[PDB]
Amino acid sequence: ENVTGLFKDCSKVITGLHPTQAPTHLSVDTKFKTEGLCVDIPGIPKDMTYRRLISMMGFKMNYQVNGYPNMFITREEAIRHVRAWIGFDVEGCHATREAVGTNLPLQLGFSTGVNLVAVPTGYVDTPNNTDFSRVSAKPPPGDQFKHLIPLMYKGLPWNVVRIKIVQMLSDTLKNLSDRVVFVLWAHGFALTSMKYFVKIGPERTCCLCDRRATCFSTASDTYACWHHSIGFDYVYNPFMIDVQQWGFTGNLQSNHDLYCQVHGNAHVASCDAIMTRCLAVHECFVKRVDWTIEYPIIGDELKINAACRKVQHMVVKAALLADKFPVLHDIGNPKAIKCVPQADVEWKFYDAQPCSDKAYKIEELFYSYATHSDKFTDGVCLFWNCNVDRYPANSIVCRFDTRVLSNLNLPGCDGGSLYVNKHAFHTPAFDKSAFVNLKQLPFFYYSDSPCESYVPLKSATCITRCNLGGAVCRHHANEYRLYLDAYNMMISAGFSLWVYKQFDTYNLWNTF
Amino acid sequence: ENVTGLFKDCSKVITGLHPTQAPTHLSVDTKFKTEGLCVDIPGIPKDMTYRRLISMMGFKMNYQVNGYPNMFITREEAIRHVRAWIGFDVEGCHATREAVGTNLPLQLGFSTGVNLVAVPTGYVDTPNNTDFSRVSAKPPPGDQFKHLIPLMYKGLPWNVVRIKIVQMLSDTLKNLSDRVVFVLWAHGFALTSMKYFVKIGPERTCCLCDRRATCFSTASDTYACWHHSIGFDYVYNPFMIDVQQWGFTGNLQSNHDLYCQVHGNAHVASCDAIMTRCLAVHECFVKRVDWTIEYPIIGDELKINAACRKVQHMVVKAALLADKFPVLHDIGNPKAIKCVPQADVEWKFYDAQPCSDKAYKIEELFYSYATHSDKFTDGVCLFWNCNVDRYPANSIVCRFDTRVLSNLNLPGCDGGSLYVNKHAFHTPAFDKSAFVNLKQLPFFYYSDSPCESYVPLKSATCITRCNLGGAVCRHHANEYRLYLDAYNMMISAGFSLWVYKQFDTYNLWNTF
Amino acid sequence: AGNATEVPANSTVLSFCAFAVDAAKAYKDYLASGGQPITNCVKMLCTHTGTGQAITVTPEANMDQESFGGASCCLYCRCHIDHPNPKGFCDLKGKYVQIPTTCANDPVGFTLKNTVCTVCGMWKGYGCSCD
Amino acid sequence: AGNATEVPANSTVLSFCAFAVDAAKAYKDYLASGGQPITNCVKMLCTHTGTGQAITVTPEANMDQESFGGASCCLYCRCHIDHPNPKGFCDLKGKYVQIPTTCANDPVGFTLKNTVCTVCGMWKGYGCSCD
RNA sequence: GGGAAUGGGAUUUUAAAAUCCC
RNA sequence: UUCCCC
RNA sequence: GGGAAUGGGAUUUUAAAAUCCC
RNA sequence: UUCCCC
Ligand SMILES: [Mg+2]
Ligand SMILES: [Mg+2]
Ligand SMILES: [Zn+2]
Ligand SMILES: [Zn+2]
Ligand SMILES: [Zn+2]
Ligand SMILES: [Zn+2]
Ligand SMILES: [Zn+2]
Ligand SMILES: [Zn+2]
Ligand SMILES: [Zn+2]
Ligand SMILES: [Zn+2]
Ligand SMILES: [Zn+2]
Ligand SMILES: [Zn+2]
């Protein structure tokens, strides 16, 4: 049929509108139509006191305009901008008394964890202009929606609500991305609610810097980014993805529960937003690591990457001098390069599948503790950023703590986390039971290089042959501070270091 | 005369029973009733093929018998057996098409996390006996119950369900208590389900030991405790408490969400059980620690207490000897017991909440970093088992990690945990953001006692006079091992030690 | 939906004995502690000229006895639980049971405590005479 | 429930200009990129012997003009958004608008682009004789 | 084409209705 | 509202 | 309260209907 | 007839 529910008249008046007042041809009264046109009848005066509610349901954002960005994006662009993902859900209420036939936004929830309750407000048609005003409404007729019953008396005016939305989005995303991606399940009512707080147009620039404009103010027609959006009320040019359009059957919870167990509490807007983002992250990221997609630097990724390599070199160089194992096993190394080339030890490499390394010396190993307990009975093992069920008692382990959230460590699926440094690594949930056979590694600095020279260093953790005397030179006094900062940065990023229980510093004091 | 819904005849047959087959005077048909009595009509035969479902809803367990313990205990008594608390929730299905008017257990859930699905089974009065048999049933109408539709095709026989229940209860509770306390929200259908797997009687003893009998076996007419209940099929003499009787209004989710944000996902039996036990824990323990109630020493509590005492003494002595603070603030300790009496430092003592003593011995201190950061700039602050939002940069802190669950640490409310060591202490959720001004305390030993005195010690962390030589004497060599065992036990129990960032052991080495 | 069977005054003793391992011992202990007997039994209006046998297919009450429906004088039929018989069947259901008029206030307890002489079909100690 | 008032062919542009900051610019950019104009306007029937003024109380079109209802030729009344007028009132609504026959394909765009002469009462460049 | 069914309880008001819990 | 049978 | 959808092909007869197969 | 959303 040649009708749509967009801009539907929900008023209870049995008659239509006058030809000089009806917005469309389907809105004019039947008494005026004649042979497909409308004829002015002096006997029917136009109405000057009517109020007609207009439905904002049924938007179609499929415009193709030359200088305008498109709101809906492809899945590859969403994978690129995963740092900007904010789940979004809306729970609504039904217009009841003076108008029936539309739903109004009641509780808007985001994956950040907030719920904003708004006064039921609609767009009514008056003889002068469309008026944005409060309308009578009732909660949906269902037991599942009974928790929405109090919220009808707890809403805020939309002027407050949209300013709070802009504040929350800017405070969440200003150190992560230059845009917002809304992760939706069903976009119809989400778009109907976005009509209340989202405006679009050509791409712009912030009024105080060179960043992309993300917010618009109607008090003064100015555009700003996340950093300069204080007092701004509208979201300008957002992006969105609909997850249900990825071939899903059933509802949101039935699909989320197949892959995750730490989120629940359906029909709450924030909880469903978290569920939507979790399902999207699972569908786009928990398969394998993709090195064809690269992410921009937003912080201390370079320092973390340097500090990890520095610690990995120093710990292994100290361990191979402490007890002098004749052979070691390196497990989980993507490429066949030993951490310390100068070591006089037999390196044997094992991995499930290397990162396309030409050196095929790496043996196949799909490790499991109950299966490979007798594989590495002798010699020190290395597990650097390798995630297994349990480590043996003779290992040196670096493990990332998924419970440490930061700009690099986004929330993940089923208790895991999405670590985005240069690529996106999905890490399963941290378990301390995997470290029952090990102990936490202490901090220490070690070097054998010759040295030549504001308080001088006074610490028992500087294991150097220079420190055997009563003083230490300035070269090691600076390099120890550099390694201390590197170790602090590495442990603050979320990395935990574990060593075998027999490890101690005294043997290192015997290396001189 | 009034009637009760217990043992209601749910069968769809319109007539009553024969006077020789009716169990009560209400069951006999109106043909035979006369003048308040019954008549034997010679011609009427008795039915020999009827199948009358009997309703098990409406049990009243308010008996008072001398040798028989009562199932429903008071909350003052349940607080003393919090280590036996197991939340319990049942979902149900409606009898249909051969009997209407009763509900049968479908999904049984517990706070341990398990869900057990049973085939719909009922009690059917037959002309020979009462037959415990599978009956027709349907899931309840309503959207919220639609997830119960798949459960009708995957139930287990009840003889297996109660074996699994006994196994799970014994595995959970054999190292915690000598009984079970079921934490319920509505005890009606809970009792109706307990009819299927619970037996009562006088107090008994285990068949293989002198422990309280908690399980019964029909295959051998024997009683057992949690340790010896292999193959037993009934729970014998359990206890229970109804939380909704404590004055709550509304549903379980509404009251639970007022205090906790961790649990959700209502209408799944295990999740509802977890919510019920969480609400009970909040109502009993989040208020304040009750020193009047003591708990039995289940295991390793005295060793952990001695280890904590020794570690605290050593670290405070080492810090005061190394850095020589003018004032030490023993924050959160109402007692003026000095852990090192001979230290050349003055001591101040505070309490988080006002105690019963009105003397001027201690001062009030509700510490928060936003209000008390600059009040203790000089000296050192001893935060031993005191929980604050953020610690200052001059502190020695011992903090319990609520994510390390054990027999002494039970799950609590809103992410916290209930630690039971001679008393019940509810501790808020652990966050690593409270230690941004501190660093992890290294493991070390210090000796200040005279060195008057089998493998020689080769560790460089033993800060003692005899370590500056060929070998450590066997007195300190075994005392260091004892302190290492104490440290490992303490940090395995869940205690984390933090110190101000400028702590160094080398200042101790200049003491000799 | 459904037709009620029991009165509220039996709610406790029927809930107790339906949970016990030994329902006869439980009922005896409930009575010993001042509890009240199970009521709402099915008593017959009869001529009281019968042979006076303990269990019959017709109400055969003697002048010193009262006749009841059998299923109402069985604790296991009253609590809807398993019978302790090896076959699991009831000896009282489908029959009429004659209880002495002195013990007619608690017929359920009487049928538990007493037994029937085989050679005459009388309650032992109540109308039985074989020794 | 309710009465549907719009055709599917208008679903795109009306969804566009409703979200746009500048609806007048958005409509012109939509037209300039190959989009079709707004349909389903109300068209009046008359003798075409009127005065020819741009906006009138009654249909008053000339020989080369067609009258439309004023509410259907205002873009903001179609998109149900804020009028940029000084008090938010509409000048077309409650009046009849005269569109030239050659421009009758896009009556919304004609009212957006063109203006009226305040001293003669008809469209500038499209019939006004004072210039 | 034929047929069946739509759970349990508490409270209040005037058998019925409403509210609440499961 | 749901199910069974044809 | 809002909304969407009801597969593919062949043959015959007068775009539609019917039949058949998947 | 069926599904999604509220
Ligand atoms: Mg939702
Ligand atoms: Mg439940
Ligand atoms: Zn800016
Ligand atoms: Zn999830
Ligand atoms: Zn040096
Ligand atoms: Zn035992
Ligand atoms: Zn909780
Ligand atoms: Zn010594
Ligand atoms: Zn019986
Ligand atoms: Zn005899
Ligand atoms: Zn207008
Ligand atoms: Zn002019």
Curated annotation (Swiss-Prot), chains A, B:
Residues that hold S-adenosyl-L-methionine according to the record: D330, I331, G332, N333, P334, K335, A336
List of residues binding Mg(2+) 1: D89, A190
Binding positions (Zn(2+) 15): H256, C260, H263, C278
Compartment annotation: Host cytoplasm; Host endoplasmic reticulum
Domain N7-MTase: 295-512
Regulation: Inhibited by Remdesivir antiviral drug (GS-5734).
Signal sequence, renumbered to the chain: none
Record domain ExoN: where: 71-286
Residues at which Zn(2+) 16 binds: C451, C466, C473, H476
Residues engaged in binding Zn(2+) 14: C206, C209, C225, H228
Reactions listed under catalytic activity: a 5'-end (5'-triphosphoguanosine)-ribonucleoside in mRNA + S-adenosyl-L-methionine = a 5'-end (N(7)-methyl 5'-triphosphoguanosine)-ribonucleoside in mRNA + S-adenosyl-L-homocysteine
Binding site for Mg(2+) 2: E91, H267, D272
Spans annotated as GpppA-binding: 413-427
Function: Plays a role in viral RNA synthesis through two distinct activities. The N7-guanine methyltransferase activity plays a role in the formation of the cap structure GpppA-RNA. The proofreading exoribonuclease reduces the sensitivity of the virus to RNA mutagens during replication. This activity acts on both ssRNA and dsRNA in a 3'-5' direction.
Protein name: Guanine-N7 methyltransferase nsp14
Lineage: Viruses, Riboviria, Orthornavirae, Pisuviricota, Pisoniviricetes
